[PDB]
Amino acid sequence: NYQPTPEDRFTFGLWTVGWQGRDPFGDATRRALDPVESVRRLAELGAHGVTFHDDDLIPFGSSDSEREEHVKRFRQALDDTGMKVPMATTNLFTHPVFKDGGFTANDRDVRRYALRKTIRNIDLAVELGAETYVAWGGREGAESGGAKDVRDALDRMKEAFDLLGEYVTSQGYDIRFAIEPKPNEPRGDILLPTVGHALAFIERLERPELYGVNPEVGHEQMAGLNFPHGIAQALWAGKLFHIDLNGQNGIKYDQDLRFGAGDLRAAFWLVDLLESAGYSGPRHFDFKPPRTEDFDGVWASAAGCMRNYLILKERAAAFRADPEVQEALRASRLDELARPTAADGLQALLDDRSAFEEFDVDAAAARGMAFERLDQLAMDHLLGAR
Amino acid sequence: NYQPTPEDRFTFGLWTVGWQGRDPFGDATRRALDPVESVRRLAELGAHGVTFHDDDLIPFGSSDSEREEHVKRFRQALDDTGMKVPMATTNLFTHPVFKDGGFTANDRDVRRYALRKTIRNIDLAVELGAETYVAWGGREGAESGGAKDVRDALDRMKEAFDLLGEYVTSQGYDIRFAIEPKPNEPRGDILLPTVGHALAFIERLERPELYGVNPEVGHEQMAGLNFPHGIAQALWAGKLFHIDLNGQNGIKYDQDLRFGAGDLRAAFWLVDLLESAGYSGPRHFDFKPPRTEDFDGVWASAAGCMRNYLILKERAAAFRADPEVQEALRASRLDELARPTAADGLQALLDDRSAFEEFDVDAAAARGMAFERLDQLAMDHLLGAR
Amino acid sequence: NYQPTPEDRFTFGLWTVGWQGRDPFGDATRRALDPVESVRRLAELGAHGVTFHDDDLIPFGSSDSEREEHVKRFRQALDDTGMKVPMATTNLFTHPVFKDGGFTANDRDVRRYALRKTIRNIDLAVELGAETYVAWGGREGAESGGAKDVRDALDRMKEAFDLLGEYVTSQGYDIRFAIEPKPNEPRGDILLPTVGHALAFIERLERPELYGVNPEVGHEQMAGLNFPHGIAQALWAGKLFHIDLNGQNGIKYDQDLRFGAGDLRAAFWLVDLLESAGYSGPRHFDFKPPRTEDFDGVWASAAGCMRNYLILKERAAAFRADPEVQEALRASRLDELARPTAADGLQALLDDRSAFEEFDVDAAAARGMAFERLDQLAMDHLLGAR
Amino acid sequence: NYQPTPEDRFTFGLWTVGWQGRDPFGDATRRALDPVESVRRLAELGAHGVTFHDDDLIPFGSSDSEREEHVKRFRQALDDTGMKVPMATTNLFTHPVFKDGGFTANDRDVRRYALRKTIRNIDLAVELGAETYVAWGGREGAESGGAKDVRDALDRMKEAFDLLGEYVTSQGYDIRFAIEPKPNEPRGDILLPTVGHALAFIERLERPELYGVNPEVGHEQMAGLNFPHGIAQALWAGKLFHIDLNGQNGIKYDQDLRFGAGDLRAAFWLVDLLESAGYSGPRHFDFKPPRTEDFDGVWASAAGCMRNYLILKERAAAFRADPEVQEALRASRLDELARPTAADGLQALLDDRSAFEEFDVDAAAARGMAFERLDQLAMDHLLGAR
Ligand SMILES: OC[C@H]1O[C@H](O)[C@H](O)[C@@H](O)[C@@H]1O
Ligand SMILES: OC[C@H]1O[C@H](O)[C@H](O)[C@@H](O)[C@@H]1O
Ligand SMILES: OC[C@H]1O[C@H](O)[C@H](O)[C@@H](O)[C@@H]1O
Ligand SMILES: OC[C@H]1O[C@H](O)[C@H](O)[C@@H](O)[C@@H]1O
Ligand SMILES: [Mg+2]
Ligand SMILES: [Mg+2]
Ligand SMILES: [Mg+2]
Ligand SMILES: [Mg+2]
Ligand SMILES: [Mn+2]
Ligand SMILES: [Mn+2]
Ligand SMILES: [Mn+2]
Ligand SMILES: [Mn+2]
């Protein structure tokens, strides 16, 4: 039951199932994985593909010959399995040189280095077939108020993204960029901390059509925000280029639980929205199998990400198809929400006495919205209790 | 010491000092105030002006003759004191008809009513001299996932703001709109929950130049976000049309404490940024004197808002003017953050071996940023301990 | 399916289904309910009983004759339906006199009044059959640091609870007290903010055996705490005298959603624990039907509280009874967690070389805990996807 | 100005200034420090002493000869500087064997190992002069509901603390234990997550007088709780055996900023309370210099912890000594809060008509508490703006 196949477009970062379990208070609990092994094991579970940071696929500091062999072995694993590489990203956070940021480091030489490291990896990502290049500015931010003038930092961040767009255009590449917001951790506060801040920033770039967002479930929940609402705004803007799926229990450190863990009802409404909107990109899991697990638990955790998506997909589709739910949606006026407020135009609205002078405010106020009945139908569908 | 005068541009909502102290668990602890009295008492404290919701100035349901007398008395209080009215707003949240929203109510007749109620008050706001019209969509949102399709709701919200822009343009008014974000409360989640989401939405409106943000200290802090950072992004976008100043202790209900209470260091960095950026709009307090207070405590609380702004203004200016701080800012490379990363252009960056092939990553990583020394100078300045 | 009956011990506060929908930003959306009607409608839904604050059952300020008639009508509704009254409480938060607290008000005359108001209602609660008397100190706390010396306030709170215990002992009553913690709202911070702080305080009372806790799902979640863990500690202490069931979406204002809404997985683990531990008290819902609802939605929301408890009870029981889960629990060493660490005693442990000198730390570290497989079995059971 | 000396009792963990800067997303930015160097540098800054985990002072896995040399060098640094060692603790979190806990690990052999590792270090702590032994159960908890039966885990935690008390009693040691709560991180939820839960647990131990709490500023703030309030409850219980001072910006990952950073007003009210209550234990800083800093920034950050404590101590003492504040405290009835509610006894209260039948509730309700004036005096004192 609920068995994934590559057609479901489920993808995993090499750093997810490859996480060795080091945390701020703990040493590694698992040995490092060869990317080749991760590709094979994920393919056996029904995954569609994998994603990578530059430094996950090629150890930092590798010589050209070593780099060529790493890529060759990875390419052979992709060929052996039929796995794809839909997205890649740059590691601009692990190395100490990035301790104050990459694109917005106060040191200009570090900013130039970060751009060169990214451009090198864009070339590789294109070679491996990626359609999206993600930027997660995890080190862009501050622990103290004097350390970062944010207007200057946003100037530098715009310059960096503009140069990357000039670069991909210069090479004729079709790849597009997706900014992954996060509100905090590892910096005390991170620039572009939410989907909204990232969407707003893109609109000031030179070529905004090249940039979208890669929202992550847990990151918007770390700000206490409603992730399905933020996804709806990204879709409304035409900017949901990619998504990171995982679980998070509220406002605390970034947990990266498997998808479906954390806020289960939010996971249900997310799947409902992605399927209703026809999102066609990768269903990418950015999760960490807990460091309590051995390698068998790693693969059980990855399998559970995909299983939970498929269960929620079934339950959301049953909800929207149920005639009793369709009647409840009309009872709650979701049909009226989708109708224009004033297609008659401004002057007609101003002249419409039923909109003000003769509007019976008390009769309107007395009409219940029937949202609790609708939501209990949604709960009954989610739980299989209809 | 620290005595405000009207030139400091401090303004207060009638609903702030007028709050009677009703909370979700408590009846009123103070009698209602006549707006005329609030104008007089605020003017005596050194305020520049006042702001209003339609229903603060004219009781809901007033006849035309009553409305004319309310406005006449208010105008005479403004004339007697020299107080101004720089901003007004519509109450689209108190009346039960708005229980599911105003501009994004599922009922289309309620959406049309909300627009007509707003347009009536825009006319009054212009008559009283307001330069900004604020929209706080406190009822726009949901407690459950099925109750609001957010893409449809954003369609309705765009339609509403577009019609309001068509209206002000049709009348030749100079007033501009400012959206006030809030993440939650009274709805479980509110649409446009942060500065970023509001900035992003404005960019999809028909006439984006007419709309900016009215961020509130406590609202961004209710999402755990850094308010000075969000203000910097709004300034970077050219969209800080107005601001609401108050205090909040972290992620919990909207406290609306007096400015300077709550997160004191964030208040310091906010004042530093507003003064450095040359923000020229009203310094508006959206606060509630705690319901423990009598009327004398109300005015003490309002006075404390202005006092705390003026103390922080002095301390931030002393910080930025101190030669030892200026040296520390250079030591931490804030000068380098303000320099373009690659004014030499993309090809020059790609050909620059000092940016990659010959970049000494370890030497760069070893350079301390000296941010702790800088931040302790900032603390010493804030505390008057230099 | 999932139909409650009085044997399931579900109870509701009169203030829950009776909530008129006033919030900090909104007027009432529903008319007041007669307690008699609430008793009848709840009984028809399958409830076991109701609970009350003094001022829910008898309007504040009633004369003795009015008080007698209110009680008489309520008693007749209980007799007509077979509903019980297992718990009552005092309203020490709505009236303005309590603006700085009841038992810990700075004014001594208010503290004495609060005690007298409570004692009057203890007598009534006993007359109506209540076994538990709840204290929720919603006004005990502060918005500012100077306003409340907390050691002195805890002295006053101990004095109050000690006097109430002296009173019930003096009358020969069997009723016991349960303190309901909440971290904040309506005060900026509330004294005894969590289950732990309340348990710790009880241990300093004169007669600790008379006092336990009445934890509420949403209140511990407002501090980001794990409600099943806090319930387990209360059960471990022998102090779970009563419980308040509802839903909450994380750290924000007190939402009081219907049970099962909010954090669904936490609701599952709570029901699992209450049923496994054999909790025999009332399953009391302290919830507010959202103000979007009409009276039909009120009863739909109350019905959904009970339905969701019964669904989760079925799924948790199926989880614990499944032989595959029982094998997974052994694989994860939950059996070993329940065995004493050192029943052999201290000297035997000190002399046991297998505990230190010869303990193979690496072999132990390499053993996976298999928690992800266990948790996916739990998810499959909760979702009915086995 | 504000220069610390050893008489101020400021202490630092070796792991604080010794933190190399590894975070969940970043490699080390600083070289490891020799404990001898940290002792010397801290002594030069005016510190009183240092604290240690076993594995900070002696590398894990050291032979007896290596252990003896590590201790010998450390003892010579203490002798050379006059630094003391007032507290020590065990590392039961870094090694992978502790991935599911130490005292509450599901594996019984790990629980026995954790006890033996602790007992070995208690002996060393006593040899070095420590008066307090801290337990921070950072790995005691869970990411999922099935993985840990919390009642069984609390049984195991009680067994462990009881055995440690039996051990110290058996040796005639005077050292006492202090439990350090934390709500989450590194586990999804940690057992005994707050001061209150720890205080409540101690009351169920065999010899409760041997155990107190070691609360940390940032940890209670990670639950959104008011740290001065929790400290007041610990003092009220007689259980403040030790304290960890640092800074935290609200509900997010554990930041461990230097003391005075984070919530400055809470730091002021904490210092006010510690000084007013006459707390005589170490003023211990559990902080991490940010990984942006070099070694000079490490010592600047440590110096700033002590400076900020001394500034706040001066400002709080000036507040409490100011006759205008003393008058404001009487105006707000803080004197009445410290008076018994009913020293006349229960029967006198029941017979006192001024407490109920003749209490003028409206006159009492109308009396303002004057808390805003009091709090602005506190702000003026903190800012040096009187
Ligand atoms: O950008 C790719 C990834 O980089 C890092 O691993 C971040 O922790 C993760 O959130 C992000 O998705
Ligand atoms: O929009 C004007 C005001 O409306 C309401 O009073 C909101 O509570 C407040 O935040 C907002 O500033
Ligand atoms: O104490 C009884 C009840 O009093 C109030 O209604 C509180 O809001 C609620 O949480 C509590 O359960
Ligand atoms: O228990 C001593 C210390 O152990 C660890 O370093 C914890 O991170 C810290 O909070 C605690 O104080
Ligand atoms: Mg991610
Ligand atoms: Mg506001
Ligand atoms: Mg309750
Ligand atoms: Mg600590
Ligand atoms: Mn994440
Ligand atoms: Mn507010
Ligand atoms: Mn509640
Ligand atoms: Mn900490």
XYZ file of N, CA and C in Angstrom, chain B residues 4-17 34-52 71 73-87 125 127-131 282-285 299 302 306:
186
model
N 9.581 65.832 24.875
C 9.189 65.870 23.463
C 8.508 67.183 23.145
N 8.588 67.549 21.879
C 7.838 68.676 21.342
C 7.231 68.222 20.031
N 6.241 68.953 19.514
C 5.608 68.520 18.257
C 6.580 68.294 17.097
N 7.755 68.949 17.125
C 8.718 68.723 16.048
C 9.278 67.298 16.010
N 9.150 66.535 17.095
C 9.603 65.145 17.096
C 8.634 64.203 16.383
N 7.470 64.692 15.991
C 6.522 63.966 15.145
C 5.914 62.739 15.837
N 5.737 62.790 17.157
C 5.141 61.664 17.878
C 3.620 61.730 17.749
N 3.008 60.616 17.367
C 1.565 60.535 17.207
C 1.026 59.297 17.917
N -0.272 59.342 18.224
C -0.944 58.292 18.999
C -2.304 58.005 18.383
N -2.712 56.737 18.345
C -4.076 56.434 17.957
C -5.066 56.790 19.047
N -6.265 57.242 18.625
C -7.287 57.491 19.637
C -7.575 56.222 20.432
N -7.449 55.053 19.793
C -7.730 53.769 20.427
C -6.662 53.324 21.426
N -5.541 54.037 21.529
C -4.419 53.634 22.377
C -4.686 54.120 23.792
N -4.511 55.424 24.021
C -4.850 56.005 25.307
C -6.337 55.861 25.634
N -13.481 60.873 25.675
C -13.890 61.690 24.544
C -12.640 61.985 23.717
N -12.672 61.763 22.392
C -11.530 62.141 21.540
C -11.015 63.539 21.783
N -11.911 64.491 22.089
C -11.485 65.854 22.366
C -10.543 65.891 23.556
N -10.863 65.126 24.606
C -9.991 65.100 25.777
C -8.639 64.469 25.451
N -8.641 63.367 24.698
C -7.384 62.740 24.314
C -6.506 63.688 23.521
N -7.096 64.449 22.581
C -6.298 65.406 21.809
C -5.652 66.426 22.739
N -6.438 66.961 23.684
C -5.907 67.968 24.606
C -4.796 67.382 25.474
N -5.016 66.178 26.029
C -4.024 65.636 26.960
C -2.749 65.252 26.231
N -2.876 64.715 25.013
C -1.687 64.361 24.244
C -0.898 65.598 23.847
N -1.610 66.661 23.454
C -0.924 67.897 23.094
C -0.140 68.442 24.267
N -0.715 68.366 25.474
C -0.007 68.849 26.659
C 1.263 68.050 26.931
N 1.291 66.771 26.545
C 2.477 65.914 26.714
C 3.557 66.161 25.658
N 3.259 66.934 24.613
C 4.207 67.194 23.562
C 3.994 66.415 22.282
N 2.864 65.728 22.133
C 2.593 65.001 20.906
C 2.403 65.960 19.733
N 2.651 65.428 18.541
C 2.447 66.107 17.269
C 1.049 65.880 16.728
N 0.468 64.706 16.956
C -0.822 64.455 16.338
C -1.431 63.149 16.807
N -2.566 62.842 16.202
C -3.381 61.685 16.545
C -3.808 61.009 15.258
N -4.216 59.745 15.409
C -4.760 58.961 14.308
C -6.045 58.293 14.792
N -6.820 57.777 13.825
C -8.131 57.249 14.187
C -8.579 56.151 13.243
N -17.330 65.286 14.139
C -16.199 65.829 13.392
C -15.943 67.283 13.789
N -16.491 68.863 16.640
C -15.832 68.960 17.934
C -14.382 68.525 17.829
N -14.133 67.477 17.036
C -12.764 67.000 16.877
C -11.911 68.051 16.172
N -12.451 68.645 15.101
C -11.754 69.719 14.397
C -11.430 70.883 15.328
N -12.360 71.234 16.222
C -12.079 72.335 17.142
C -10.959 71.980 18.123
N -10.894 70.712 18.571
C -9.784 70.296 19.437
C -8.443 70.349 18.704
N -8.424 69.939 17.431
C -7.204 70.075 16.634
C -6.802 71.539 16.503
N -7.784 72.409 16.227
C -7.476 73.828 16.079
C -6.988 74.456 17.380
N -7.552 74.034 18.515
C -7.198 74.593 19.821
C -5.772 74.216 20.236
N -5.278 73.065 19.760
C -4.001 72.507 20.200
C -2.887 72.571 19.173
N -3.219 72.701 17.891
C -2.261 72.589 16.833
C -1.892 71.150 16.501
N -2.622 70.188 17.054
C -2.391 68.790 16.699
C -2.797 68.489 15.257
N -2.088 67.543 14.643
C -2.330 67.112 13.271
C -2.951 65.712 13.271
N -3.463 65.301 12.110
C -3.978 63.944 11.863
C -3.244 63.345 10.672
N -2.095 62.702 10.879
C -1.305 62.262 9.728
C -1.770 60.973 9.110
N -2.607 60.198 9.789
C -2.938 58.884 9.275
C -4.301 58.526 9.848
N -10.612 61.102 6.047
C -9.196 61.199 6.362
C -8.536 62.323 5.568
N -10.060 64.950 4.306
C -10.556 66.215 4.841
C -9.777 66.651 6.074
N -9.380 65.700 6.927
C -8.656 66.037 8.147
C -7.147 66.140 7.954
N -6.633 65.952 6.739
C -5.246 66.205 6.464
C -4.345 64.991 6.428
N -4.908 63.778 6.473
C -4.055 62.592 6.563
C -3.291 62.343 5.272
N -2.030 61.916 5.424
C -1.182 61.610 4.281
C -1.091 60.116 4.023
N 5.700 59.919 10.593
C 5.297 59.962 12.006
C 5.956 58.862 12.827
N 6.273 59.195 14.083
C 6.686 58.192 15.072
C 5.419 57.880 15.855
N 4.666 56.900 15.370
C 3.325 56.603 15.855
C 3.379 55.484 16.875
N 2.706 55.663 17.998
C 2.644 54.636 19.032
C 1.310 53.925 18.948
N -1.685 58.466 30.986
C -0.849 59.554 30.462
C 0.607 59.338 30.802
N 1.809 57.000 28.066
C 2.021 57.702 26.799
C 3.274 58.561 26.866
N 7.318 58.379 24.445
C 8.101 59.441 23.826
C 9.435 59.623 24.504
